[PDB]
Amino acid sequence: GTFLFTSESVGEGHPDKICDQISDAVLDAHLQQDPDAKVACETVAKTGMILLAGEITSRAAVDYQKVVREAVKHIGYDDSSKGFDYKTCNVLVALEQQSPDIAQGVHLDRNEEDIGAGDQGLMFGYATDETEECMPLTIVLAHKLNAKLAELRRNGTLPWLRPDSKTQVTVQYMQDRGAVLPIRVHTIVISVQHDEEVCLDEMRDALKEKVIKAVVPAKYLDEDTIYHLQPSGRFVIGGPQGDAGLTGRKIIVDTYGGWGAHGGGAFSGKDYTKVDRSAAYAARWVAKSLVKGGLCRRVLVQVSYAIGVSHPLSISIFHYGTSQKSERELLEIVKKNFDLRPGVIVRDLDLKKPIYQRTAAYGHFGRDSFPWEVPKKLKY
Amino acid sequence: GTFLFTSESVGEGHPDKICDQISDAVLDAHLQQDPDAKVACETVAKTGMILLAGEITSRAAVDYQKVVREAVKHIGYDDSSKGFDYKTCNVLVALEQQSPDIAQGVHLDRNEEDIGAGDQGLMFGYATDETEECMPLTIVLAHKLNAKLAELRRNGTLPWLRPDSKTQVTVQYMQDRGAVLPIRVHTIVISVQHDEEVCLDEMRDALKEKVIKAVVPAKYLDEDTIYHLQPSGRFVIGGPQGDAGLTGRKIIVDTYGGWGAHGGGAFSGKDYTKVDRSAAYAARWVAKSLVKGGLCRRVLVQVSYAIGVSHPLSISIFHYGTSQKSERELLEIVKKNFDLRPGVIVRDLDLKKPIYQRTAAYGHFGRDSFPWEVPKKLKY
Numbered sequence: 001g002t003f004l005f006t007s008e009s010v011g012e013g014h015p016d017k018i019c020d021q022i023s024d025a026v027l028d029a030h031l032q033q034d035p036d037a038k039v040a041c042e043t044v045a046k047t048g049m050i051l052l053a054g055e056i057t058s059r060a061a062v063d064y065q066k067v068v069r070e071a072v073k074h075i076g077y078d079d080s081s082k083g084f085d086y087k088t089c090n091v092l093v094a095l096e097q098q099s100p101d102i103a104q105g106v107h108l109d110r111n112e113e114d115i116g117a118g119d120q121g122l123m124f125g126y127a128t129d130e131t132e133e134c135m136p137l138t139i140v141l142a143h144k145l146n147a148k149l150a151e152l153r154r155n156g157t158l159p160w161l162r163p164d165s166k167t168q169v170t171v172q173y174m175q176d177r178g179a180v181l182p183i184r185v186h187t188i189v190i191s192v193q194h195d196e197e198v199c200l201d202e203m204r205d206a207l208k209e210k211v212i213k214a215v216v217p218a219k220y221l222d223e224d225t226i227y228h229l230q231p232s233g234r235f236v237i238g239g240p241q242g243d244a245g246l247t248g249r250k251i252i253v254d255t256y257g258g259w260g261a262h263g264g265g266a267f268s269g270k271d272y273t274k275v276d277r278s279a280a281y282a283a284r285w286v287a288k289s290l291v292k293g294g295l296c297r298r299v300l301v302q303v304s305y306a307i308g309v310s311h312p313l314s315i316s317i318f319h320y321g322t323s324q325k326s327e328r329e330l331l332e333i334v335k336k337n338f339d340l341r342p343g344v345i346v347r348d349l350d351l352k353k354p355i356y357q358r359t360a361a362y363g364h365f366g367r368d369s370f371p372w373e374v375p376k377k378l379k380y
Numbered sequence: 381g382t383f384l385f386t387s388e389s390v391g392e393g394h395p396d397k398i399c400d401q402i403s404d405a406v407l408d409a410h411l412q413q414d415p416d417a418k419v420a421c422e423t424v425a426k427t428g429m430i431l432l433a434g435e436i437t438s439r440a441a442v443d444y445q446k447v448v449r450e451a452v453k454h455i456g457y458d459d460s461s462k463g464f465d466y467k468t469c470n471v472l473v474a475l476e477q478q479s480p481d482i483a484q485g486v487h488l489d490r491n492e493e494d495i496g497a498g499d500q501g502l503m504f505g506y507a508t509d510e511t512e513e514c515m516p517l518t519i520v521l522a523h524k525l526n527a528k529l530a531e532l533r534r535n536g537t538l539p540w541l542r543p544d545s546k547t548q549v550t551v552q553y554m555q556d557r558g559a560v561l562p563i564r565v566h567t568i569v570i571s572v573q574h575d576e577e578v579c580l581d582e583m584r585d586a587l588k589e590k591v592i593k594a595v596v597p598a599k600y601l602d603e604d605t606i607y608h609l610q611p612s613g614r615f616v617i618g619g620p621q622g623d624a625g626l627t628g629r630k631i632i633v634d635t636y637g638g639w640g641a642h643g644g645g646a647f648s649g650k651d652y653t654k655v656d657r658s659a660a661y662a663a664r665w666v667a668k669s670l671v672k673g674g675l676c677r678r679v680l681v682q683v684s685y686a687i688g689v690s691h692p693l694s695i696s697i698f699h700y701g702t703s704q705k706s707e708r709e710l711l712e713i714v715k716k717n718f719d720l721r722p723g724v725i726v727r728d729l730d731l732k733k734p735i736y737q738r739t740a741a742y743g744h745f746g747r748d749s750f751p752w753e754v755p756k757k758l759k760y
């Protein structure tokens with residue numbers, strides 16, 4: 001009756017995540033000055049280069065050089081010995097205004113509540129009662145392993161660590177009437193960039209004793225757990241020098257780690273009129289509200305939009321058999337309690353606030369009591 | 381007992397899809413000369429620009445200018461009046477060799493069958509008996525609508541069409557013992573770039589009569605079907621000029637349209653040692669083999685890897701209740717019939733052949749009897 005499930009996470013210095021963080025630093029910089037900025041900022045990172053490309057229409061005056069370099073500094077790439085340095089990297093900017101054809105179809109001369117979706121697309125929300133934060137254990141543990149690496153890098157106790165890391169956690173689960181119950185950790189992978197001097201045995205010992213044991217409860221680890229620690233054997237070249245990064249290439253790390261579903265839309269670098277972000281956050285809010293409200297133990301929500309149209313085209317609820325109410329009944333409860341127009345979501349979730357860089361590593365969900373993590377009390 | 385589900389697709393000239401096609405044109409060009417080329421080619425597209433960035437180690441001599449421009453020509457961007465022209469665009473190249481640290485951990489001095497996975501990650505395969513090609517109807521119809529647009533553009537019958545398009549199809553389904561049965565089309569969205577002269581009523585009439593009716597069986601369309609045709613009202617600016625494109629930003633369009641699950645890894649621009657592609661293709665092959673073999677009606681397969689390790693770390697089978705056999709029994713059948721090491725998958729699926737550009741629009745699955753679409757006869 002048991003099964004395995006695997007999820008991964010990446011660290012703040014993983015090149016794709018660098019791009020997500022930069023794109024959201026750019027968004028935040030615009031929103032600090034112009035809450036109605038229209039932002040669609042993609043970032044590319046390769047050896048020695050950050051390129052910004054996309055579309056921004058805003059009243060803000062933003063120093064892209066400074067914003068980009070400060071984000072890279074925070075991540076920890078501050079010297080050529082680490083493969084990348086915020087002080088001496090190339091920052092190239094290929095930003096244009098938002099297409100006027102998009103603007104006229106989406107938001108020009110529209111009442112805010114009746115703004116159209118900024119694009120077509122589909123989005124999902126998911127929640128599971130297997131953890132208090134209503135997230136899958138696999139992805140929670142994978143994120144926490146990367147956060148622990150960053151902590152031990154920044155506090156100087158593992159000074160050989162560099163910012164680029166990846167983790168992967170496989171958990172053995174039991175099924176319980178559509179809900180899932182974690183039993184044990186089956187396999188853990190950790191790969192992290194390191195300095196030229198530290199040897200493999202020192203790193204593997206530290207990753208087990210100072211990282212895994214500081215994160216994963218001992219009850220989940222046993223003599224059969226498989227550890228793949230620095231499995232490549234050498235990871236000195238890293239960051240953008242080891243692998244090109246792009247915004248929106250970690251969309252499963254950003255969400256549910258393979259659980260539930262994904263509609264394909266990236267989050268970072270986008271203002272609220274891009275329903276890829278706002279409606280995914282709202283769908284998480286719905287799903288978590290259903291689970292915390294006791295209506296389900298596990299639930300997947302789909303919503304979809306057409307460009308220029310305010311109301312969603314479709315809403316669907318899938319409860320995995322974990323409710324006494326039918327999926328139709330839950331859908332009616334959702335429709336009576338939520339208004340998923342983007343110009344309403346923006347108000348309910350406060351999506352003009354410049355908090356987005358904080359979302360761009362360690363997952364957008366399950367953390368810090370962001371507005372989409374605070375369940376709505378449902379009337380039914 | 382019914383529910384809605386929505387999927388989308390994009391056309392060959394959608395800027396993200398342009399990037400996928402270019403990245404796979406680059407891969408194919410290398411593989412034509414060096415079947416063992418190591419390729420990780422990301423493409424970015426914005427107004428007037430194609431940038432190649434990533435890592436290639438290969439014995440091939442490739443003219444990137446020519447390869448890129450020929451791909452853009454095939455797509456149809458051949459004049460400034462369309463927003464982009466293969467003849468006069470900027471092609472910038474930021475390609476380096478594969479990291480030697482990766483190479484040593486993955487494939488150097490390794491027997492081909494025992495090559496390590498080129499990265500960690502998780503991948504899913506999915507199959508559903510609702511169509512003969514074992515794909516969801518929503519995504520099949522969405523792809524076919526984009527293909528029809530391209531056909532009518534290329535044959536000159538709708539000469540106002542341009543290459544950038546998006547479609548979205550919402551289908552109303554019934555559940556049947558874990559399987560799904562399409563009933564009717566609930567909503568269709570089509571947005572397509574167009575010339576400055578054609579009016580909105582002409583376009584909307586043509587999209588209904590020459591596109592939708594030529595693609596979607598009349599039995600699925602009724603007086604209640606909702607049509608959002610050119611919903612933005614104006615789409616003259618398009619392609620990279622309207623929206624930046626990046627490789628690997630259409631991973632749900634490339635796969636199952638929201639159905640099943642996704643592990644996050646993009647396909648295009650990657651050789652077979654990148655399990656993001658090879659193992660996803662193998663997982664599709666497994667899933668389709670289970671459905672065509674009569675063991676399931678619907679199935680999701682998860683596999684996962686660690687960099688440098690040949691065998692998958694985990695394999696999981698989820699059959700939605702559509703088999704008399706337990707998921708454990710199906711997993712044993714899979715393990716007895718499939719060897720999911722990348723250096724074996726490459727042989728079974730012929731993944732050194734330069735056919736990848738053909739996969740990079742209209743979905744990687746459900747078409748053209750590629751090797752992963754030909755079911756394996758299972759022994760059990």
Ligand SMILES: CSC[C@H]1O[C@@H](n2cnc3c(N)ncnc32)[C@H](O)[C@@H]1O
Pocket residue numbers: 014015016164165166191192232233234235236237238239242243479481482485498499687
């Ligand atoms: C294998 S390249 C994809 C990702 O894997 C990581 N990576 C890069 N080099 C190595 C390496 N030598 N060993 C393990 N992981 C690596 C980096 O996070 C990179 O973005």
Ligand SMILES: CSC[C@H]1O[C@@H](n2cnc3c(N)ncnc32)[C@H](O)[C@@H]1O
Pocket residue numbers: 099101102105118119307394395396544545546571572612613614615616617618619622623
């Ligand atoms: C809204 S920008 C995201 C995508 O939507 C498409 N698009 C661009 N401009 C428009 C427009 N004016 N109307 C409808 N869709 C558009 C293009 O495929 C683009 O890549």
Ligand SMILES: [K+]
Pocket residue numbers: 243244245420422434
């Ligand atoms: K990459």
Ligand SMILES: [K+]
Pocket residue numbers: 040042054623624625
């Ligand atoms: K974009």
Ligand SMILES: [Mg+2]
Pocket residue numbers: 016244245246249
């Ligand atoms: Mg990547």
Ligand SMILES: [Mg+2]
Pocket residue numbers: 119120121264265276
């Ligand atoms: Mg999208």
Ligand SMILES: [Mg+2]
Pocket residue numbers: 396624625626629
């Ligand atoms: Mg895109």
Ligand SMILES: [Mg+2]
Pocket residue numbers: 499500501644645656
């Ligand atoms: Mg990956």
Ligand code: NA
Pocket residue numbers: 073074075154
């Ligand atoms: Na810091």
Ligand code: NA
Pocket residue numbers: 128129130131132133134
């Ligand atoms: Na809970």
Ligand code: NA
Pocket residue numbers: 182183184219220
């Ligand atoms: Na336990």
Ligand code: NA
Pocket residue numbers: 081194195196197236
């Ligand atoms: Na060093």
Ligand code: NA
Pocket residue numbers: 252255256257258259260261262641642
């Ligand atoms: Na997921």
Ligand code: NA
Pocket residue numbers: 367368369
């Ligand atoms: Na909290």
Ligand code: NA
Pocket residue numbers: 453454455534
């Ligand atoms: Na052609």
Ligand code: NA
Pocket residue numbers: 508509510511512513514
């Ligand atoms: Na079938």
